[PDB]
Nucleic acid binder design. Sequence first.
DNA 1: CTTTGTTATGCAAATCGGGGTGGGGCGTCGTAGACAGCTCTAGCACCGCTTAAACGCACGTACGCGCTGTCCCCCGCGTTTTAACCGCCAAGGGGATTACTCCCTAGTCTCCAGGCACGTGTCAGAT
DNA 2: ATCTGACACGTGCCTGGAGACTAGGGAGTAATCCCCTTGGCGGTTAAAACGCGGGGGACAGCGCGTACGTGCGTTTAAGCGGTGCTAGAGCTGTCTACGACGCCCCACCCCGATTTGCATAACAAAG
Lengths: 81, 82, 95, 94, 79, 93, 92, 73, 109, 109, 78
Amino acid sequence: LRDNIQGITKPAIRRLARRGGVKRISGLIYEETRGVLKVFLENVIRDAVTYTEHAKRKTVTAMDVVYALKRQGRTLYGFGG
Amino acid sequence: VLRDNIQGITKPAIRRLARRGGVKRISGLIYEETRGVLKVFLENVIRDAVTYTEHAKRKTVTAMDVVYALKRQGRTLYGFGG
Amino acid sequence: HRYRPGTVALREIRRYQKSTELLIRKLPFQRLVREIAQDFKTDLRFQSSAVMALQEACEAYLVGLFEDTNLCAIHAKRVTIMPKDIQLARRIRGE
Amino acid sequence: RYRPGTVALREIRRYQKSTELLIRKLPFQRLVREIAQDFKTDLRFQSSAVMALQEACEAYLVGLFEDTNLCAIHAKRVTIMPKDIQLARRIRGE
Amino acid sequence: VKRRTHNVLERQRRNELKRSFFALRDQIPELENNEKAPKVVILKKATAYILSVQAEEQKLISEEDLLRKRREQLKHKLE
Amino acid sequence: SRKESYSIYVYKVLKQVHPDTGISSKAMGIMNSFVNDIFERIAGEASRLAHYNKRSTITSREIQTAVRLLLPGELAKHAVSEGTKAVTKYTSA
Amino acid sequence: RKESYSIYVYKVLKQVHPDTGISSKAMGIMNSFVNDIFERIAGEASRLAHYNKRSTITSREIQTAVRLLLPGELAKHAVSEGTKAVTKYTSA
Amino acid sequence: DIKALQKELEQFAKLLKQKRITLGYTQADVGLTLGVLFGKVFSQTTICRFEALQLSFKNMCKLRPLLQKWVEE
Amino acid sequence: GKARAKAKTRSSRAGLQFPVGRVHRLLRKGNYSERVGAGAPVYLAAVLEYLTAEILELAGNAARDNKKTRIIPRHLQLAIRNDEELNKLLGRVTIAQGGVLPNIQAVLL
Amino acid sequence: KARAKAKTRSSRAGLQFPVGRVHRLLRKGNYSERVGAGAPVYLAAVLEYLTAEILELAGNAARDNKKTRIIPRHLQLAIRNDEELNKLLGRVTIAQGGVLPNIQAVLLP
Amino acid sequence: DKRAHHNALERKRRDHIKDSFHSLRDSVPSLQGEKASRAQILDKATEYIQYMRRKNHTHQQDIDDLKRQNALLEQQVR
DNA sequence: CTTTGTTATGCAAATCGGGGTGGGGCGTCGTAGACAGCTCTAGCACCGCTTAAACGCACGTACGCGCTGTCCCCCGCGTTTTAACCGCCAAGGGGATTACTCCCTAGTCTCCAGGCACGTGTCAGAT
DNA sequence: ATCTGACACGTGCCTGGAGACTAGGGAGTAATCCCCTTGGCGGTTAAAACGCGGGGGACAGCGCGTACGTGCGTTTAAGCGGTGCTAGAGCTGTCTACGACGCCCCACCCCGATTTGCATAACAAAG
């Protein structure tokens, strides 16, 4: 897979900004936002994969994501744990 | 019975801290705001340090009680123990 | 008839704050997650619940960032958010 | 007389280079005892416990001032205001 | 045999320690000529010597710090 | 294969507080994770206290201390009172 | 009597910088450092064992904890050094 | 005979519907009235499904006795 | 507390709804300590129940305010974020499908 | 490493850090019921590596300041001028460490 | 009598040496607060004196250098 | 148009029962800590003297703040197009489980040496 | 004459570690089955993409005006060194109340049907 960051469209970014209470978005936000999201995903996925490899499992489970997030100080409820 | 020792933190002391932080100019309202922030910070650290001390049935607060009080808040301190 | 600019923006802010559904479509999100995962290790599989967990955290993360970004723009006496406001919020947060 | 800001920059370099505590020890001790007194009376402190508090407190305030300074710059100002401190604390989540 | 081994190892350990005493003794100017200096004197005077030398360091660093401050003030005057 | 949860106890508490109110399965999953998180936090803090005091047995004193540290303000005050009450009644004849 | 790593720090420093000393305050800091890293890894290894329903901590849990705790090059080098030390110990 | 039982339940359900309409009651009112009589306060959904024969024969047999009292009352 | 209990269950003796026996078991399996005092799981169970009740009460009120008879994740989010003590305790927690508070600033109007 | 000739476990592993001590420390604190034989060896190697890395940088900082002894200032510089260590120890306060001499361009003439 | 007295004299001799070792041990930062053998204390004291000798020499060099720099700056100032 | 109750029904949730297990007594036993006592460390209160730092005030001016004006570029809306989603299908692989088996660490005991000090011989300078 | 202190020899002596087995438990390995992930296909329609015209806000520049910085003289209390006092930190010894652990039995919890309401929407009337 290549360049699926484009899967995050402007409207999707705008809608997230709307929950944040933003009325106006500059044209440079969309590119900056995608860069930030990519980094966030890499940090969570890298750890979730590390857990998965350690366990000798071929598949990533919700608990691997939860542990990956827990270590970053971001506790998640409702997905198990 | 101690009262109003927050005034022990003088303007120069605040100015010097701000200067270490790279601040070039300081508003006159900073001094009061700074004291308010420091008081809150101390209350949170001391409250935990005292709680640790009381749990151990001790009357003296030790450096390790402060270290644990700080470590607990995500602010690990080196050189006073581990 | 046409609405004055900003009328809709307020409508959308209220509407999206009231609602709880995901804003990012699942299929392209999955493709993004898989692309990244393939860099760390190849031939990985994911449970559908793992993907949902990732998206939920991501949206909550980005919204929280936008809230702080908005505060920075307000502090700067602006309405429009710029990359400077995002970068400042992240720098203060400690990311 | 030096142009204003000339001295401030000298002081910034001076204090960034040095490592000693900027807050006077006795005034600080009284403040710590005053606060501790509200949780339990007749408490005693190790002299090293006080030093531990000073070190954490100054490090905390200095880090806060650095973030405060960034807020002021973002606002296109040199002078730091309570508005900048409150924003920095709001973002940090204090 | 084990007793003999212990005897000689301890005998040598004493001699090795004596050599360490001499190495320290020879390094202290106060004991330079005192070839028969006893263990207790070497340790006591070594302690006193090191402490006086450490006190000298504190005096020297104080002068260095004052001179650095003077250097900065003189450069400031030239500016 | 059996999966344990606290959903039955969460349900009973709600039944006593708001007898006419039901709870969604998603809300229940959240409440279940909440209980597990608080349990870990207190048990973890109690473990640290026992270690810091070089003690090997955890008692109500360590837990009470952990509660005072973990919960803020009035919430802590009430939790301590309830904990004290439960133990006092439990050991009382 | 209290335990510390100051004797080992002295030896490591001698091997890296044969003509550099260390202050007592700096030494106190290095001891705080070692104890902090130890706790982080030991704690993380404990969590990993718990998550996988294991009761024994081995080099695999520690290696994993290192990958999780250390950033960048430090994780890469620490793992290589750890693996090397165990390999030598096993054959020693 | 399951078919004979089905017919009996269908006949009651038809009579029940006729009684409800004749008395001017809603399906919700029937369930509320059963709550008064037995303590079991049924929703309109259960009553609707009973009349619509969407319930199993076993369920209709178990609820019928309560509905029979409703018809008498 | 309760004047008396007849049930053998330790949870009943303590006047609690939460399972004391399970809390005791978990404390022993989590290796938090070599030994766990008998009163330890009793105190802890009481705390877990208390906190549980506080959230459910607020969430139940939120459900009533929204004219709903069932608690949903949205209500839990509102229950926590509108309560200072709970918001501090769970401030870093993300609640699935919880949404956000309807916070509108004057500068937006 | 190339060879081993020792009875001491630390020497067999080629480490300066005490393997036997680490082994005891792993048992302490109830980290696990059991500890693998190679566990303390792997960990000791990691602790030594990181220790050496900081000391090397701090020693270089000492030379830059024409000092023959490492002081807390040097440790602070060694960490804050190194991205990997700064991330690892970014939350750590170092006694008498001081701060980096960073001044913003907007404040300068 | 004499043998028992000799034992007492020998005990006192050893006690003075043991205390003197401790005082010397605490004088060298490499052993301060640490366990050390008799030989280690002597060896560290020996190298530490050599260190302090060259350290104090180095300090004097820096003093002489700063004095000379100050003299040059003073000459420019006057 | 806008407002409102009646009944329909898809589907998530509350309830029932049957059976499997882990909670709770009960007794036994080893030890963790509760408690008393004692030493002596360092924390606190006080004092006097020195002197650097803190305080108050005069005096300019560098920078914050309010206003004007211009012009970029973001919003809202209409119209086209493009993948997301939904429903359905099958393939297989990997995750969970159960049953062996072997090897590896907690546990206990053995013992070796490396610094350490008690006790004895002695040897020259000092009372 | 003998006293004091010194080096040096005989030999126990504490502890710290590693070495050697040893049983019982955990973890590794192999087999098997079935749920759940991946992948594909067609239809449809909600959302994304794109163009454009207008107006609102970003931003540069200008002028005040006052709040903040900088000296300078004077006051205050921080800091340092020294004295004395005792509360309580920290250690050790005794001994018992208490929690681990083994074993047994049944009332309570899990999960699979199974019943039954909740929220939303189709189907009419009323001002």
